[PDB]
Paper text:
Coronavirus 3CLpro is a cysteine protease that has two N-terminal domains containing two β-barrel chymotrypsin-like folds. The active site of 3CLpro is located in the cleft between the two domains and is characterized by a catalytic Cys-His dyad. The polyproteins are processed by a 3C-like protease [3CLpro or main protease (MPro)] (11 cleavage sites) and a papain-like protease (PLpro) (3 cleavage sites), resulting in 16 mature nonstructural proteins, including an RNA-dependent RNA polymerase (RdRp). X-ray crystallography confirmed the mechanism of action of the inhibitors, which involves formation of a covalent bond between the active site cysteine and the carbonyl carbon of the aldehyde.
Hydrophobic and hydrogen-bonding functionalities were incorporated into the 3CLpro inhibitors to capture additional interactions, and the position of the cyclohexyl moiety was also examined using appropriate congeners. In the current study, a new dipeptidyl series focusing on the design of structural variants in the cap substructure were synthesized and evaluated for their activity against coronavirus 3CLpro.
Residue numbers in the entry:
A (entry chain B): -1 to 72, 78 to 301
B (entry chain A): -1 to 72, 78 to 300
Amino acid sequence: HHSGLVKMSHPSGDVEACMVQVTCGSMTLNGLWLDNTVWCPRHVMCPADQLSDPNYDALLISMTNHSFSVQKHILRVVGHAMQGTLLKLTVDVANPSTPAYTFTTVKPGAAFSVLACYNGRPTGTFTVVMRPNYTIKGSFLCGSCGSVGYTKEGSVINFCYMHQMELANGTHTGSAFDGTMYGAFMDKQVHQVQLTDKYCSVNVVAWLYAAILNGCAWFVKPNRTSVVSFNEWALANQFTEFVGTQSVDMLAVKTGVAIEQLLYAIQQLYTGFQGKQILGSTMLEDEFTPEDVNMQIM
Amino acid sequence: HHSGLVKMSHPSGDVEACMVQVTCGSMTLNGLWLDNTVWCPRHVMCPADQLSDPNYDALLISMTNHSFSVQKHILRVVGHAMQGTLLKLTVDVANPSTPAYTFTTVKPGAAFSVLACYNGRPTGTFTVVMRPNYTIKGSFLCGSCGSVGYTKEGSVINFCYMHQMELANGTHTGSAFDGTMYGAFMDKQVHQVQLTDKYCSVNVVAWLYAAILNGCAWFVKPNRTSVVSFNEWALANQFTEFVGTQSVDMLAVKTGVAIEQLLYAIQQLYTGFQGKQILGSTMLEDEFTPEDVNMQI
Ligand SMILES: *[C@H](O)[C@H](C[C@@H]1CCNC1=O)NC(=O)[C@H](CC(C)C)NC(=O)O[C@H]1CC[C@H](CC)CC1
Ligand SMILES: *[C@H](O)[C@H](C[C@@H]1CCNC1=O)NC(=O)[C@H](CC(C)C)NC(=O)O[C@H]1CC[C@H](CC)CC1
């Protein structure tokens, strides 16, 4: 039986109306136009020559307001400033389609939508999970920097990601809108190695609840492992710490299966399912969130 | 190495702008507002009581324009007609933000984006493949009927799907905008014969090409199988006819691996990968298209 549990993105219209193209000399990428501000990655300021030890403090100083061209396809720059790894450009027109929005950094295991853009033109949307090593997967090619990731709660869009780079292993990372880069990473063109990844325990729990909700519960036993004992075990077996939420608790209540029974199950299934399947899979899945499961199965 | 091959949907803004809620007596669902026309599933006319064998012709006759209420959240009806399994409602105001559009009927193996809506409010977007048995997977709950699926050629939206129903196995089907149901399913709440799914061979080929481009070519041998023998093989082993395309050919040029090498490979890998992996999987994947792979890699 098909669960109906699929990778689902937020509708992108609200964010499509905010996307612009930013150009600084030879470099062109994408920007986010909210009210009188345009956000974009600061390496738009760097010529490909100096991309390996860029001196951003001196590059900023050398710019005037005319150094920046902002175009809308899907504007006059009257101020410029640097905030971490992002530029904050002030323009003389307030975006007439600015959504209600917040800037909140996301934590590992959280899911968000990405609107992939090239030259200020939205081309596609997909959902990603911030991994415990502060990378995301997804699809990003040359020119995609400035593409934004976001969630939506009510009328309020939370902008949480602005795309910056791709790593050697093909994963990706970027900034939060406070200007910090997710994970270590520096916006320089140099080899950077990401930390070891980990399974997102709370998302595995959610997925196993989805399985129970879908009729697949051969893996449930009376046996239980406590949260504290699971987290001790998790440090040493490449799982994140489990933190519960009202969202998980809703699934426990709905199914009548306690969280602690699923943490025990995870300790057994970790290694393989010995010929059985769960939701058409033979390994644990950690990219669906409790919120995903509550939305799409109930 | 993460290949960068993901399930990508079209930006939904253009379509969000056309979504409305349609109410008829006690039922409500979603509709599509293009110019002066609102499209919605005709079972909006059916009371819950009588969803097993509705008399749609008599329901339509029983109606008047004032039976139907249309509201845009994300409107007065002055005409109403039935086209197959859909209603075509004429409203007095034209949708100003009507995108350039056409109506197309997707074929099995083809991908399209879905805007899932409840009460006229877009809530989510995902991509599906029309399966060889004319169903789709996706995520659709109560109130989702009237959600639409679409492709894009340029700035032009091709509307191909309006959601109608769920089958006992959890899969879904809907109407094309000419009013016909994909796969001849009836918009009646009754058990119906669902054919068996098959592997979309052309998408399997595209996936193997993606593996090659990602530096996973362990399965590539100089051995070759012709299209016609493969297609003969495919009938007895739950695969679809392979039909080449310019998109596929681009991939054999990019990689330098010929189609027939991969058709031979499919015949071997169908039995299992024998301890090895392809793009993190131990089974063949058939929901990424030639167009996906070219676009994303
Ligand atoms: C801005 O559009 C790009 C996005 C890259 C391009 C290729 N795929 C992407 O996601 N960002 C960068 O190019 C970035 C600039 C520095 C200054 C941060 N550098 C970068 O991502 O380089 C990568 C390119 C890919 C290779 C392959 C492993 C490694 C370095
Ligand atoms: C219109 O919004 C719904 C969408 C369904 C409902 C639940 N999930 C969906 O995809 N369509 C219907 O409700 C449909 C109406 C008839 C007149 C076509 N009925 C329907 O899909 O019946 C299904 C419901 C689930 C059961 C499962 C054994 C089979 C029949």
